[PDB]
Coordinates of C-alpha atoms in Angstrom, one line a residue:
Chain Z
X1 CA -4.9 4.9 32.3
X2 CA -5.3 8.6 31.5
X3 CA -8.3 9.8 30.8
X4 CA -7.7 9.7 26.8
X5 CA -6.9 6.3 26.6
X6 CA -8.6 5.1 23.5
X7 CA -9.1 2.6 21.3
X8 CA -8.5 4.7 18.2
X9 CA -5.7 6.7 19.3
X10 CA -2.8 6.7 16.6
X11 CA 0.5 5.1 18.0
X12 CA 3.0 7.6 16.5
X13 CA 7.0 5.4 16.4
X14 CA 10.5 6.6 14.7
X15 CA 13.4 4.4 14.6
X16 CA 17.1 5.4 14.0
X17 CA 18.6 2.2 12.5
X18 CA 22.5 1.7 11.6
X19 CA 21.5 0.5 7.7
X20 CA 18.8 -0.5 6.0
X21 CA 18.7 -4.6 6.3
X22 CA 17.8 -5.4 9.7
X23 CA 19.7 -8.8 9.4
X24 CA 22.7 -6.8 9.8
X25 CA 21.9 -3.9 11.2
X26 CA 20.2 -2.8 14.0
X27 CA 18.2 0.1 16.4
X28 CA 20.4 2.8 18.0
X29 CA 17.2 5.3 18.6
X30 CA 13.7 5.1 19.6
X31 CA 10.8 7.5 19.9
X32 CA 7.3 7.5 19.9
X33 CA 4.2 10.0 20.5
X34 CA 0.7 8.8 20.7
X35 CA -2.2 11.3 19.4
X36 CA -6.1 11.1 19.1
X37 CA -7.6 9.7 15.8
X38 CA -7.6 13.5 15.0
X39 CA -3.6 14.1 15.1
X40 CA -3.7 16.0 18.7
X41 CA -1.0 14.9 20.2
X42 CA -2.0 13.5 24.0
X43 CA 1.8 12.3 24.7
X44 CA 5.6 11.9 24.1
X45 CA 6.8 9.4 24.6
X46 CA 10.7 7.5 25.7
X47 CA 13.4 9.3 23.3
X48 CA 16.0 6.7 23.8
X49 CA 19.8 6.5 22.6
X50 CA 20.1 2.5 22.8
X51 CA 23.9 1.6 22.5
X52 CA 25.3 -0.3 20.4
X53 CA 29.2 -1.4 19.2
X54 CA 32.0 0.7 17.9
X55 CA 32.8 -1.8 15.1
X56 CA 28.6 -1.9 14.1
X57 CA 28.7 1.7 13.9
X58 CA 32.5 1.8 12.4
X59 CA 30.1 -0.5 9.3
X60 CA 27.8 2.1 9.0
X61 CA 27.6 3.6 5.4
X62 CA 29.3 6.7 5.2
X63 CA 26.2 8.6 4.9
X64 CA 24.9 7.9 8.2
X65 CA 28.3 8.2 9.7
X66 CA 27.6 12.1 8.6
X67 CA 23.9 12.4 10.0
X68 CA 24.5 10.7 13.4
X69 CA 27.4 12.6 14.4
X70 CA 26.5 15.9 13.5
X71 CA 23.2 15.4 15.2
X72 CA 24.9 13.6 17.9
X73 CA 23.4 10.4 18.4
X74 CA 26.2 8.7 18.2
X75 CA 28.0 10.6 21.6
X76 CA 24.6 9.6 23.4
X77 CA 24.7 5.8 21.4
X78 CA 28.2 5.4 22.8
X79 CA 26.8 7.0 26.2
X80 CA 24.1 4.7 26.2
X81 CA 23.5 1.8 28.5
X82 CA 20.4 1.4 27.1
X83 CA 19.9 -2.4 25.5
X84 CA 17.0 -3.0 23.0
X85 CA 15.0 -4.6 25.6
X86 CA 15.2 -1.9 27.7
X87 CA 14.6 0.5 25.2
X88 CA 11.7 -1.6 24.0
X89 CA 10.1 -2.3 27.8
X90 CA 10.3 1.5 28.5
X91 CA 8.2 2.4 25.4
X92 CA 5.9 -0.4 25.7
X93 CA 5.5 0.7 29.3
X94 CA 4.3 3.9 28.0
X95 CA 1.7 3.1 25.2
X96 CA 0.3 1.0 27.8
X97 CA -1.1 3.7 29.7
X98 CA -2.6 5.4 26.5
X99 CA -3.5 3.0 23.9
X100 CA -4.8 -0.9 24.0
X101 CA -2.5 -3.4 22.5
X102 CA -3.2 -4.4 18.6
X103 CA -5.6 -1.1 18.6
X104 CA -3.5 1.4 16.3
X105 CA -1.8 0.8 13.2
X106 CA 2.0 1.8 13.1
X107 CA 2.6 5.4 12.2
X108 CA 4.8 7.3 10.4
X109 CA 6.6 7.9 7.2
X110 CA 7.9 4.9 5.7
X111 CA 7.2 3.1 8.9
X112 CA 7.4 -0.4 7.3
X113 CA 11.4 0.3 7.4
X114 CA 10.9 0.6 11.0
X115 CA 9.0 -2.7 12.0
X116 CA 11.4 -4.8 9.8
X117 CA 13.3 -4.0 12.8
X118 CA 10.6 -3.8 15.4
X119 CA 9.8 -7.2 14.5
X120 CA 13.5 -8.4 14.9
X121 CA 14.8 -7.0 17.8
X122 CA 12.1 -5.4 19.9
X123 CA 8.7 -8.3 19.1
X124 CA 6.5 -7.7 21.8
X125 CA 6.7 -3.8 20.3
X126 CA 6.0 -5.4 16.6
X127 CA 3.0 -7.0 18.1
X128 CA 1.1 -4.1 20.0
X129 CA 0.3 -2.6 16.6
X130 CA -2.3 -3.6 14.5
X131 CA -1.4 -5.4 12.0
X132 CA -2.0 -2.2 9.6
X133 CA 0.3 0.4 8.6
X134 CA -0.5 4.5 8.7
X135 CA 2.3 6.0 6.0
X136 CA 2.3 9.2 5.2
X137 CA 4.7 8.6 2.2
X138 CA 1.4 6.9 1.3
X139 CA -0.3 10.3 0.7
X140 CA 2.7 11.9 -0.8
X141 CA 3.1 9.7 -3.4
X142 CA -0.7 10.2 -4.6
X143 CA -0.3 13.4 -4.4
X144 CA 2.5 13.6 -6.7
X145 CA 0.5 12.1 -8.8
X146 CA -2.9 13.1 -8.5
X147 CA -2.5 16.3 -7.1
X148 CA 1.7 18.1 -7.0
X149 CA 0.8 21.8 -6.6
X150 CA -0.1 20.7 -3.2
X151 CA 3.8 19.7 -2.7
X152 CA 5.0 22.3 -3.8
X153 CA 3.9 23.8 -0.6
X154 CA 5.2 21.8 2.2
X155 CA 9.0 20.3 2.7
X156 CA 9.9 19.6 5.9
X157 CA 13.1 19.4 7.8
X158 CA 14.7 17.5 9.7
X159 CA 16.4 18.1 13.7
X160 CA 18.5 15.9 16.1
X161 CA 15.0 15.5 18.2
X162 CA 13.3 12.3 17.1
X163 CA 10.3 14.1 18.7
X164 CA 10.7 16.6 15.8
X165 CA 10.7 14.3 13.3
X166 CA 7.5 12.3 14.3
X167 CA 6.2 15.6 14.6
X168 CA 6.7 16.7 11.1
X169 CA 5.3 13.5 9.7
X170 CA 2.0 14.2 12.0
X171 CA 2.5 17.9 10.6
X172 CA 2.4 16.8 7.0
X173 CA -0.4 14.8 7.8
X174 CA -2.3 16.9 9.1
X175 CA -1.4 18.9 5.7
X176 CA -3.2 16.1 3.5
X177 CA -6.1 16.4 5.6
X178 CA -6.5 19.8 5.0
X179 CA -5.4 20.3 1.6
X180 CA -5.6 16.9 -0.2
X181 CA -8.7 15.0 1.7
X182 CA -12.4 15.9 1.8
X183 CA -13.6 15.1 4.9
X184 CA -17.2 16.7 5.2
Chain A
X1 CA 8.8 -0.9 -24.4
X2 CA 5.1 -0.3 -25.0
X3 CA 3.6 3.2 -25.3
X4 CA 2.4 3.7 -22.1
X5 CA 6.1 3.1 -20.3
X6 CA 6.1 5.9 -18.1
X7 CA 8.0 6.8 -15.1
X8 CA 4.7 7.5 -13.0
X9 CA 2.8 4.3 -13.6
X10 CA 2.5 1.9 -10.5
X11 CA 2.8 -1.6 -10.0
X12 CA 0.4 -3.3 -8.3
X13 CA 1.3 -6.8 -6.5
X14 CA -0.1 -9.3 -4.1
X15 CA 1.4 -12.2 -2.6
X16 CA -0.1 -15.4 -1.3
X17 CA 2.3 -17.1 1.5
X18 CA 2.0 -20.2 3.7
X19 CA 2.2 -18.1 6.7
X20 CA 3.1 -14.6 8.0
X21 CA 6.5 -14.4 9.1
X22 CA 9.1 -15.1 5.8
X23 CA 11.6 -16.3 8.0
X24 CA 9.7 -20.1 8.3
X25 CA 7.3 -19.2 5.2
X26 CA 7.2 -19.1 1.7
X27 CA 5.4 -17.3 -1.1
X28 CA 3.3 -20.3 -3.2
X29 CA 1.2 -17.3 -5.4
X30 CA 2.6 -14.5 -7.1
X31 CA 0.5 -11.5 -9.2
X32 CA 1.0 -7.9 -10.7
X33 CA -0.5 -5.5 -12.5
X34 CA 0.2 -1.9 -13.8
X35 CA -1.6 0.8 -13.7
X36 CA -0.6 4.4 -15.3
X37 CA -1.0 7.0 -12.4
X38 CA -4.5 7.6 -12.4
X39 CA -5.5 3.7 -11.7
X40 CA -6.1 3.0 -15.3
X41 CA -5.6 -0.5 -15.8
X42 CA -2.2 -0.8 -18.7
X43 CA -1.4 -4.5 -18.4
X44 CA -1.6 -8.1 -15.8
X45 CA 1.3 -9.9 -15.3
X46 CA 2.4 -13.6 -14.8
X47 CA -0.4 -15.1 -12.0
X48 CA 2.2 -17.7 -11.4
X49 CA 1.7 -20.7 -8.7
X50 CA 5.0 -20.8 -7.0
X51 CA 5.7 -24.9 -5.8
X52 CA 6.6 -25.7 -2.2
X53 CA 7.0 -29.1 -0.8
X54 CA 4.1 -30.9 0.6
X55 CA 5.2 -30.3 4.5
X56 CA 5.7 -26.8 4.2
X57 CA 2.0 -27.1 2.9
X58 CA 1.2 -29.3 6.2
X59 CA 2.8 -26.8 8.9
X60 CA 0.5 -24.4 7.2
X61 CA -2.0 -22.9 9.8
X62 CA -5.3 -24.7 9.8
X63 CA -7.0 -21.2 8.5
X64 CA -4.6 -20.9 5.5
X65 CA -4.8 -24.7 4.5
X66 CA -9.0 -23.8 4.2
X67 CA -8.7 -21.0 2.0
X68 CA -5.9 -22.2 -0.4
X69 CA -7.6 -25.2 -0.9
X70 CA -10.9 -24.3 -1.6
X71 CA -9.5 -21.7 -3.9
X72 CA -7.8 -24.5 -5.6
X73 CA -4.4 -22.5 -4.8
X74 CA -2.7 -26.1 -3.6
X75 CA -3.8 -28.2 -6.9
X76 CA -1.1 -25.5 -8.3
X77 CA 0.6 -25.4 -6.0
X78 CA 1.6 -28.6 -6.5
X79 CA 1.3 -29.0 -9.5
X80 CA 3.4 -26.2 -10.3
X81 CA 7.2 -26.5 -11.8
X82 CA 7.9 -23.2 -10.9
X83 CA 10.6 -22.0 -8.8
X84 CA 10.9 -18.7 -6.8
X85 CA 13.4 -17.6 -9.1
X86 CA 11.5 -18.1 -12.3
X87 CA 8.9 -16.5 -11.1
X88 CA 10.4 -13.8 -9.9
X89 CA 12.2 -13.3 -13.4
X90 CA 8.9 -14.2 -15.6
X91 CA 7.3 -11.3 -13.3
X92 CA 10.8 -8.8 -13.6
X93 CA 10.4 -9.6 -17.7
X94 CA 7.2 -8.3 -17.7
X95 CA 7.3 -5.1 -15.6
X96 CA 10.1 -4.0 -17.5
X97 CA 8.2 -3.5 -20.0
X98 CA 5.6 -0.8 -18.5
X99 CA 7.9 1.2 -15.6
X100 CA 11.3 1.6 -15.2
X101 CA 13.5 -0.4 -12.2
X102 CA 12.9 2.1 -9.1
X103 CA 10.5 4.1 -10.3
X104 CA 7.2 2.8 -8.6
X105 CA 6.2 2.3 -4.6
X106 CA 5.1 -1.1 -4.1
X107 CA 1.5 -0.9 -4.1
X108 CA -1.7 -2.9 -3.0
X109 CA -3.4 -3.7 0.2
X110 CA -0.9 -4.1 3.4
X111 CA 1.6 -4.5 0.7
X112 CA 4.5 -4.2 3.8
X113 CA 3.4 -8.2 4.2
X114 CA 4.6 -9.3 0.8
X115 CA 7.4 -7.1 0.4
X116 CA 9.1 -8.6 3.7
X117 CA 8.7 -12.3 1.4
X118 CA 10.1 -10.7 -1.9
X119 CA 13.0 -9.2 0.0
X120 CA 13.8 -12.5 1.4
X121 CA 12.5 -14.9 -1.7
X122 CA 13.1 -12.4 -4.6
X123 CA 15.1 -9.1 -4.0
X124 CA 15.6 -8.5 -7.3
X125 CA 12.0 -7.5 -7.8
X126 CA 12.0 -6.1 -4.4
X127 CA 14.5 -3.9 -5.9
X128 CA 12.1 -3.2 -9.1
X129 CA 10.5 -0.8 -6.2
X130 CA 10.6 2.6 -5.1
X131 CA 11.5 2.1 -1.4
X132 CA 8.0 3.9 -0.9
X133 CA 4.3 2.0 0.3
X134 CA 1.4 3.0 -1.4
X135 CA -0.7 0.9 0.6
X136 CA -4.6 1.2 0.3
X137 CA -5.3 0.3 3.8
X138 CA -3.5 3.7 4.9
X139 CA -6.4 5.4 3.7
X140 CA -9.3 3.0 4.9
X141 CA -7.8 3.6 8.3
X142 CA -8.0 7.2 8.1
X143 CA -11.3 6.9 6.4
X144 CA -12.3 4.7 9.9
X145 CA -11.2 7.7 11.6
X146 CA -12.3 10.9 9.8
X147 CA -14.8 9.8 7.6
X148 CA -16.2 6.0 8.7
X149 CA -19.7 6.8 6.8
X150 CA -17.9 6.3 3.4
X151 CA -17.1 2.7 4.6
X152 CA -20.3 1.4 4.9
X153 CA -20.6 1.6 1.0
X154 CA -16.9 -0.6 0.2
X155 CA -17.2 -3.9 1.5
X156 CA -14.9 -5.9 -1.2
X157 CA -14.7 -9.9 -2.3
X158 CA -12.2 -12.3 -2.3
X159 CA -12.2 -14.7 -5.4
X160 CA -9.6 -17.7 -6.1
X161 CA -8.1 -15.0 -9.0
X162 CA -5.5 -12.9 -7.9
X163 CA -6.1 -10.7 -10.6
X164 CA -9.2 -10.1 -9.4
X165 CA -7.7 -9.2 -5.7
X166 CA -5.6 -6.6 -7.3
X167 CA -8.4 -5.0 -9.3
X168 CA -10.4 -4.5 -5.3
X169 CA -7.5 -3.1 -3.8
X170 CA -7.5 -1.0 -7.1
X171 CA -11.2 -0.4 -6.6
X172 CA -10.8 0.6 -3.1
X173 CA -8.5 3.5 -4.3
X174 CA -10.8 4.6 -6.8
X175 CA -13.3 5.1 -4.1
X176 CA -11.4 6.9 -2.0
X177 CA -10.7 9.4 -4.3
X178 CA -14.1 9.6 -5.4
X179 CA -15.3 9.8 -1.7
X180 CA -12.6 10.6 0.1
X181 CA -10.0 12.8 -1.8
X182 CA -10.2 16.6 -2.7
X183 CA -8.7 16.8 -5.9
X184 CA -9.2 19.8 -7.7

């Protein structure tokens, strides 16, 4: 329990998968943050490499080939001992001591990608989200539509640091809230 | 092609399933509409009642069995002729017409739910998609967490008309960018 354990604190989560069907492919990274309803963020959480075959990732599309390597996931998936339940106990582990199981909805960009995967190899993960989902692609795409100038004022990048990403996301967020929400 | 095609217009769907996880459930309703960017109703689709056997229907969980049935979903149900596959391509026909084939995010309420069942039961139209959610609940979530007041004023209804679940989740957008949104 630390002190700003709460039932609406926002369960932050970003998977590195192999491809994009599940029923073939599956996790070789996992990260999570947790913030406050109000995008502070309170922790960081496990950043793991979990390891997986040479012939899974010799299947991998040629595009991710690129993006692992150069970012160097794959030296650390190949360096991993890490299985998917430990990944998935360690993070679990973690959330416990900052948010109640089934409180927060899963968050993220795109994060309905993730829990296809979630809910296949790492369940009791799957299940201590709310059923709800928190994308931030969500925003993006209304505000393409309803309101672009404000795109044309934040692009991202990327960075071999899972913890970077989910950063971003929360950064972008926090960007509709400011420029794209009205929140009195 | 009718005059309003446009590669910005978004497809609106919702599901009804004998049960939550796709792997052991089916979808038995099906429904879609399209909207042009800004939520203007263009055109609703095939409402189509999707047959499954009678013990698929009896394995349903005693919560689902009550709904369906006093909606009337399971005289259709039943009575239906329909396969997953002509559904799927009396509901492709249509969309065709209104938005191009990867041009919209899937979009409705939790809409991560159905898509895991069209991926399974009907990845063509799964495929009609931009990989992107534009799920209304994202925004009721924030809305619960930034600005809850607004959601004492939205408390939608269910109705045995699919068409009519669409046009809430619809509604519900509406609102928040009426109450919710800063658009300029």
């Amino acid at each position: 329990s630390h002190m700003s354990f709460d039932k609406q604190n926002l369960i932050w989560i970003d998977l590195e998968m192999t491809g994009l069907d599940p029923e073939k492919e599956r996790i070789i990274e996992i990260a999570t943050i947790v913030t406050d309803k109000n995008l502070n963020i309170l922790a960081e959480g496990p950043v793991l490499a979990v390891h997986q075959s040479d012939e899974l990732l010799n299947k991998m599309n040629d595009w991710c080939q690129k993006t692992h390597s150069e970012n160097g996931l794959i030296e650390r998936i190949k360096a991993s001992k890490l299985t998917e339940r430990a990944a998935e106990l360690q993070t679990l582990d973690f959330l416990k001591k900052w948010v109640p199981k089934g409180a927060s909805p899963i968050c993220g960009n795109s994060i309905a990608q993730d829990k296809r995967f979630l809910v296949k190899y790492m369940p009791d993960l799957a299940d201590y989200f709310h059923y709800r989902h928190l994308d931030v692609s969500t925003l993006k795409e209304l505000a393409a539509r309803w309101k672009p100038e404000i795109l044309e004022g934040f692009k991202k990048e990327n960075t071999h640091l899972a913890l970077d990403d989910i950063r971003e996301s929360i950064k972008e967020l926090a960007y509709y809230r400011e420029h794209f929400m009205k929140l009195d």
